[PDB]
Amino acid sequence: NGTEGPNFYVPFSNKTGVVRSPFEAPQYYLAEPWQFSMLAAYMFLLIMLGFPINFLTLYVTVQHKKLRTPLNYILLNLAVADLFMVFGGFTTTLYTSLHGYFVFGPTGCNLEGFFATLGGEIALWSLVVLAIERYVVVCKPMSNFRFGENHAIMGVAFTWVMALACAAPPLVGWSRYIPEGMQCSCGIDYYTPHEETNNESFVIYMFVVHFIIPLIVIFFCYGQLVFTVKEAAAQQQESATTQKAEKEVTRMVIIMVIAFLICWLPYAGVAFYIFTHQGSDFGPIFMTIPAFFAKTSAVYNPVIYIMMNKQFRNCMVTTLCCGKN
Amino acid sequence: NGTEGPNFYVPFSNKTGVVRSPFEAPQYYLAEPWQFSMLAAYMFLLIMLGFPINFLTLYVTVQHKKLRTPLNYILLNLAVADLFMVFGGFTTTLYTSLHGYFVFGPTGCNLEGFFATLGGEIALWSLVVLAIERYVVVCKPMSNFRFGENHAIMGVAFTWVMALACAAPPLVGWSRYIPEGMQCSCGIDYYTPHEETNNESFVIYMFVVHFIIPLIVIFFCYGQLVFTVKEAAAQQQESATTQKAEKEVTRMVIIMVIAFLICWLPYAGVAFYIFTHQGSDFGPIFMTIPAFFAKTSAVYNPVIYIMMNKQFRNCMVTTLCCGKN
Amino acid sequence: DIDVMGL
Amino acid sequence: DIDVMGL
Ligand SMILES: *[C@@H]1O[C@H](CO)[C@@H](O[C@@H]2O[C@H](CO)[C@@H](O[C@@H]3O[C@H](CO)[C@@H](O)[C@H](O[C@H]4O[C@H](CO)[C@@H](O)[C@H](O)[C@@H]4O)[C@@H]3O)[C@H](O)[C@H]2NC(C)=O)[C@H](O)[C@H]1NC(C)=O
Ligand SMILES: *[C@@H]1O[C@H](CO)[C@@H](O[C@@H]2O[C@H](CO)[C@@H](O[C@@H]3O[C@H](CO)[C@@H](O)[C@H](O[C@H]4O[C@H](CO)[C@@H](O)[C@H](O)[C@@H]4O)[C@@H]3O)[C@H](O)[C@H]2NC(C)=O)[C@H](O)[C@H]1NC(C)=O
Ligand SMILES: OC[C@H]1O[C@H](O[C@H]2O[C@H](CO)[C@@H](O)[C@H](O)[C@H]2O)[C@H](O)[C@@H](O)[C@@H]1O
Ligand SMILES: OC[C@H]1O[C@H](O[C@H]2O[C@H](CO)[C@@H](O)[C@H](O)[C@H]2O)[C@H](O)[C@@H](O)[C@@H]1O
Ligand SMILES: CCCCCCCCO[C@@H]1O[C@H](CO)[C@@H](O)[C@H](O)[C@H]1O
Ligand SMILES: CCCCCCCCO[C@@H]1O[C@H](CO)[C@@H](O)[C@H](O)[C@H]1O
Ligand SMILES: CCCCCCCCO[C@@H]1O[C@H](CO)[C@@H](O)[C@H](O)[C@H]1O
Numbered sequence: 001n002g003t004e005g006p007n008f009y010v011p012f013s014n015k016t017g018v019v020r021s022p023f024e025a026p027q028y029y030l031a032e033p034w035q036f037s038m039l040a041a042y043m044f045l046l047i048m049l050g051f052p053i054n055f056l057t058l059y060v061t062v063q064h065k066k067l068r069t070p071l072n073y074i075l076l077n078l079a080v081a082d083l084f085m086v087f088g089g090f091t092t093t094l095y096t097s098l099h100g101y102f103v104f105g106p107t108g109c110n111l112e113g114f115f116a117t118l119g120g121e122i123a124l125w126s127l128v129v130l131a132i133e134r135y136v137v138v139c140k141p142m143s144n145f146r147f148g149e150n151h152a153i154m155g156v157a158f159t160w161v162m163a164l165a166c167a168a169p170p171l172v173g174w175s176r177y178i179p180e181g182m183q184c185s186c187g188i189d190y191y192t193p194h195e196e197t198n199n200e201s202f203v204i205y206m207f208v209v210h211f212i213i214p215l216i217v218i219f220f221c222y223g224q225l226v227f228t229v230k231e232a233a234a235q236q237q238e239s240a241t242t243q244k245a246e247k248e249v250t251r252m253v254i255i256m257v258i259a260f261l262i263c264w265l266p267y268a269g270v271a272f273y274i275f276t277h278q279g280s281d282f283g284p285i286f287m288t289i290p291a292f293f294a295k296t297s298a299v300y301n302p303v304i305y306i307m308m309n310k311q312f313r314n315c316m317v318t319t320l321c322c323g324k325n
Numbered sequence: 326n327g328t329e330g331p332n333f334y335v336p337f338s339n340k341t342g343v344v345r346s347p348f349e350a351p352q353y354y355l356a357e358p359w360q361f362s363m364l365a366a367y368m369f370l371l372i373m374l375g376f377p378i379n380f381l382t383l384y385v386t387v388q389h390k391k392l393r394t395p396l397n398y399i400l401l402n403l404a405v406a407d408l409f410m411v412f413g414g415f416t417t418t419l420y421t422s423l424h425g426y427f428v429f430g431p432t433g434c435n436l437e438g439f440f441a442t443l444g445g446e447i448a449l450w451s452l453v454v455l456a457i458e459r460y461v462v463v464c465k466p467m468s469n470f471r472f473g474e475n476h477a478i479m480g481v482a483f484t485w486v487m488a489l490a491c492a493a494p495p496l497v498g499w500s501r502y503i504p505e506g507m508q509c510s511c512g513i514d515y516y517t518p519h520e521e522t523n524n525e526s527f528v529i530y531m532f533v534v535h536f537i538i539p540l541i542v543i544f545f546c547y548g549q550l551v552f553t554v555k556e557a558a559a560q561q562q563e564s565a566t567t568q569k570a571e572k573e574v575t576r577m578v579i580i581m582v583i584a585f586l587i588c589w590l591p592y593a594g595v596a597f598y599i600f601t602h603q604g605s606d607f608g609p610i611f612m613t614i615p616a617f618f619a620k621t622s623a624v625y626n627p628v629i630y631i632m633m634n635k636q637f638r639n640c641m642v643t644t645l646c647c648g649k650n
Numbered sequence: 651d652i653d654v655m656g657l
Numbered sequence: 658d659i660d661v662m663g664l
């Protein structure tokens with residue numbers, strides 16, 4: 001069902017003798033050339049929509065004092081991370097899809113795999129931290145606390161460490177980076193058992209530390225937040241403002257949580273399925289589906305966490321409309 | 326510098342014997358396969374951004390009574406026209422670019438050419454009519470006039486007739502539809518002299534009736550409008566509202582006019598240049614530039630004439646956010 | 651009504 | 658300040 005090599009796994013059978021190294025020749029047996037072109041189209045769209053939105057976010061923060069508050073530090077970190085995803089991953093995949101394999105070879109595979117995975121984990125953990133921070137200021141879990149600059153900076157550092165924790169180890173033998181799907185982009189090898197790199201234990205660690213923990217924290221933090229807000233409103237029903245604030249805070253949480261799930265449940269979904277069923281067969285186009293969801297977050301996370309933020313949105317509109325409005 | 330056939334003109338020299346009919350085999354001598362894929366990427370982006378925005382415009386008008394006023398009839402007509410451009414032109418070009426030539430053959434060429442050109446002219450003349458209408462209500466050029474439903478409907482009919490005036494005649498011998506540029510999309514033949522179809526006279530007619538007249542009307546109508554508004558504000562300087570209204574009405578006009586020019590000055594620019602210099606040589610990628618600008622209007626005209634319309638924008642936001650907001 | 655032009 | 662969370 002598959003062909004193996006020293007640094008790769010092509011999901012196609014070499015019984016016809018047709019398979020080549022994804023580092024050396026096109027994979028047009030894996031998929032038609034047009035399907036490669038459509039990949040490149042999707043890459044192009046992600047860069048064309050992703051870069052402006054994420055860049056613009058940084059650009060207005062330079063332009064507007066009000067944006068440069070601690071509680072936004074993490075949303076900035078999000079945008080940077082998203083940009084690592086576009087220039088680390090998307091631009092490269094665009095280049096390679098048009099060749100039909102991974103031209104840059106193994107060393108490139110690791111570069112591309114590291115930075116693309118770094119970005120994604122940073123963004124992910126930023127989402128978690130933001131919820132932790134929100135939880136702390138709104139729910140006031142600890143007396144005599146005021147969230148400041150030096151806390152915000154910890155939050156950021158924490159993201160970068162947790163992302164390093166995921167992206168770094170494959171570079172040094174615990175798991176590995178190899179082309180996935182149509183072999184134009186490189187990712188963590190979570191589908192083949194590579195005893196030499198202990199893939200299995202890493203896939204466990206990843207699943208536990210970098211999916212169920214985030215998921216629990218997000219659900220707990222926002223769960224409490226919604227509870228606190230609902231409670232306050234219930235006791236202050238004379239205030240229509242507070243009732244509005246409650247409804248809107250609830251709506252955003254549902255969106256954020258549903259969005260988070262759309263982003264990571266497919267990746268976690270198939271990884272679990274491949275882990276549990278080791279005997280299985282998996283197409284190239286099937287393997288790209290979890291990726292498709294996770295990567296598109298570079299566009300939609302900013303939309304949710306930034307463009308739907310009244311403050312950022314205003315500054316963006318004035319900056320975009322040459323000042324005023 | 327070019328190769329000729331019964332229904333086409335390939336901008337490449339068949340001195341090496343390599344050229345084929347753009348209806349029968351790929352043109353990968355005209356351009357690399359990746360450049361075809363990037364075309365398809367650009368098509369994909371235009372459909373992915375164009376269809377939602379333009380469709381959504383119709384969808385909210387069903388959902389919101391306030392939108393269904395006569396003065397919006399033409400903005401609806403705009404959106405339909407834009408949709409003719411995406412399904413008539415863009416989807417097809419996406420399909421054909423992935424093949425590397427115009428698979429659907431001559432008959433398809435005319436279908437695709439007609440509907441794509443129809444859409445574009447309708448949109449164009451909608452922009453002109455809207456300005457005429459705006460001019461009439463604001464500048465009040467004729468006493469005892471009130472713009473109503475039956476006028477709005479004339480405005481629309483007028484667009485469709487003027488577009489038929491441009492798109493229809495090539496189907497019946499005055500000019501013709503042939504693949505252009507990379508031969509994946511069909512347009513009016515305004516670059517080769519085809520005495521049999523009297524291209525020259527048609528290109529003149531097109532330039533005069535369907536570019537300089539529109540341009541004059543737009544400039545005149547909005548020119549007067551800005552004059553009227555500036556004058557009123559000058560005489561009512563005690564009203565900060567009126568001063569704001571003036572500035573904002575001026576800003577929109579500049580945008581609309583500058584946008585219109587970006588859309589049609591390149592097409593008119595090269596057509597004039599090819600007409601004036603008949604001895605010339607013109608690449609495939611050069612010929613696609615005028616098109617690139619005109620086609621992208623399917624995205625940006627709605628943004629300017631609809632998404633930047635406070636009324637449409639509000640209804641869109643509520644409809645998009647599941648009601649409320 | 652005149653301001654309903656777009657704004 | 659609590660409402661500055663995003664809204
Ligand atoms: C998928 O399967 C195909 C076939 O199973 C496989 O491609 C094959 O790879 C081998 C290399 O392992 C190729 O073998 C070469 O064949 C040519 C004959 O044309 C030889 O000249 C090569 O060099 C040798 O000869 C020399 C003697 O003077 C020796 O010095 C040298 O050591 C070699 O023996 C070499 O033998 C074979 O041609 C291809 N077959 C095809 C159809 O391409 C492919 O690698 C598999 N894919 C993956 C990803 O594993
Ligand atoms: C660009 O230039 C190339 C070359 O200039 C040109 O392609 C050529 O087209 C001609 C057709 O006009 C092809 O001619 C054919 O050649 C084969 C030989 O392999 C013949 O069998 C064909 O059929 C004939 O033979 C029969 C006799 O039994 C007759 O019944 C019949 O009438 C024909 O004579 C035919 O002659 C030629 O092969 C190609 N050359 C190449 C390289 O493809 C191409 O058309 C030009 N492009 C454009 C867009 O104009
Ligand atoms: O002249 C300084 C302006 O920027 C300030 O913002 C900074 O605040 C911190 C100061 O140590 C920095 O760490 C942070 O990165 C900056 O955003 C301030 O907010 C502005 O009011 C000042 O005009
Ligand atoms: O029940 C009718 C609702 O729609 C109306 O809008 C229509 O107005 C014209 C009536 O002849 C039509 O030509 C036009 O196409 C429709 O938009 C009305 O605006 C609404 O208030 C009514 O609820
Ligand atoms: C981003 C690239 C994803 C490709 C989108 C097309 C959806 C899959 O489509 C199918 O793929 C098969 C091969 O896998 C083809 O043989 C079929 O004709 C095609 O319908
Ligand atoms: C965004 C710009 C993309 C760069 C263009 C991609 C380069 C394509 O390069 C192509 O690669 C083929 C491999 O199948 C080879 O036949 C040739 O080297 C070339 O045609
Ligand atoms: C989360 C449960 C399964 C863990 C296996 C890791 C899944 C693949 O790894 C993912 O690759 C994507 C593209 O490289 C990146 O965007 C993600 O950040 C990365 O975690």
Ligand SMILES: CCCCCCCCO[C@@H]1O[C@H](CO)[C@@H](O)[C@H](O)[C@H]1O
Nearest residue numbers: 355356357360361363364367610613
């Ligand atoms: C939408 C498709 C437009 C192609 C964008 C690439 C810009 C042109 O780019 C040039 O085109 C030449 C051939 O024309 C190539 O040989 C050159 O390598 C390339 O740089």
Ligand SMILES: CCCCCCCCO[C@@H]1O[C@H](CO)[C@@H](O)[C@H](O)[C@H]1O
Nearest residue numbers: 032033034035351419420423424425
């Ligand atoms: C959006 C979906 C696009 C449909 C896929 C395009 C069909 C590609 O079809 C291809 O055309 C080639 C012509 O060069 C031929 O080699 C083959 O018929 C096929 O590989």
Ligand SMILES: CCCCCCCCO[C@@H]1O[C@H](CO)[C@@H](O)[C@H](O)[C@H]1O
Nearest residue numbers: 442445446512515531532536593596
């Ligand atoms: C306007 C001055 C030159 C007239 C020559 C006509 C230019 C090509 O025609 C244009 O083709 C585009 C794509 O088919 C369409 O979007 C436009 O509506 C159409 O006018």
Ligand SMILES: *C(=O)CCCCCCCCCCCCCCC
Nearest residue numbers: 320321322580621624625628629
């Ligand atoms: C300052 O006020 C200048 C900004 C006003 C111009 C707004 C025009 C909108 C452009 C939308 C771009 C869509 C095209 C994307 C596809 C390439």
Ligand SMILES: *C(=O)CCCCCCCCCCCCCCC
Nearest residue numbers: 255296299300303304645646647
């Ligand atoms: C009702 O309130 C539901 C709407 C709220 C969800 C908003 C989420 C934004 C999605 C943006 C999509 C970007 C992806 C485009 C690339 C495929």
